Amino acid sequence: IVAAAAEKKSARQKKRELIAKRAEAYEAEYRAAEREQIELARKARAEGNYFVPHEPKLIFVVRIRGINNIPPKARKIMQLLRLLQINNGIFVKFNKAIKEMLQVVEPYVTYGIPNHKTVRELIYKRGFGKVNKQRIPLSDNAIIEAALGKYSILSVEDLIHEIYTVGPNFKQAANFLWPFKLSSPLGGWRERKFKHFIEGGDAGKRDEHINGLVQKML
Amino acid sequence: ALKEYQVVGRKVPTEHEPVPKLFRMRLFAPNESVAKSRYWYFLKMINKVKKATGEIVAINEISEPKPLKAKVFGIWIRYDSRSGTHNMYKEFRDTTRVGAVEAMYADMAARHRARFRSIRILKVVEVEKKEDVRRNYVKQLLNPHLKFPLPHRRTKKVFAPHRPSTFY
């Protein structure tokens, strides 16, 4: 009994610094990624040339209209996206095929590129894993290691990396994650909620301004 | 509020056009997203460059070089009206180009019932020469001995015990 307990504790410990080393590596990678973008922009400005950042592979989509008076095409699309309520949020692998799909539900959803804090804030607080078709909160790393252990995801930091950086197993990581059930935004929306964001409304693409909405949502 | 942006862009290079030309516009928008869309439709209507085959290469907010010097700005704009076409040129005295544009938008919405999408700004230029100023009210402000009493003095604490002063 003592040998088994010691063996359990040891292997569990060896898993712990493994998580610690991975999380440290991801944090260093993020800082090195932001440093290089700043250096690339600075040197381009110094040379008079211009630099185009990478277009982010990750998008966060929030549904902003109720389940009423929606055309069946938009209804089916949001069913595919798993946006079955207002304020529901999802991480989607933004690519060529997703863009035209979102062009149809543009009046009904708003989307933009989330930053590290937003994706970290959402998973820690609104993060509920989908285990055995049940909505289970991510209260420990045991759930993550037992549900995504076949894709080398062992902790919350590993899941955050696979989501934020759009890893090879992004589909599995996102599908494991129940849609975020965000609250109504503190402070409220704009005067009109159902115009285009570019026209003073709230629907449609908003790029780096989705973070400001998410802070109110949380 | 508003901020002035410069948007530089081009179409995606191909074999037919290995080095596409670089198109830069100075335009005003509340945020970068509106500026990029404002630029894209302008590029569509001037040079027929599609948004899909193009890309925004550089976005840069611009701050006023001398926000502490009062200046006079003349604004050439085009309006969409009942006839769908009109040309106007106004003058505003303000210390910032952004504020001058904001004043222009407020005045046009107040007078001609003009909205942001209905107004397209052609050119906002500074008029340093006093003689080049055309507007009489601007010239009135530019007179050296300008003086006038406070207009619209207008003045919870309900039930004041004494009568208002509203004078000196």
Binding site: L40, A44, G48, N49, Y50, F51, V52, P53, H54, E55, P56, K57, F94, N95, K96 | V8, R10, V12, V19, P20, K21, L22, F23, R24, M25, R26, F42, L43, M45, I46, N47, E55, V57, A58, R78, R120, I121, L122, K123
Partner: peptide, 21 residues
Amino acid sequence: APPAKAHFVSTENNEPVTLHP
């Protein structure tokens, strides 16, 4: 098609030209 990657856009050959509507 993946999103467009970061690249360079040399302008010394074609300096930006001012466009007005």
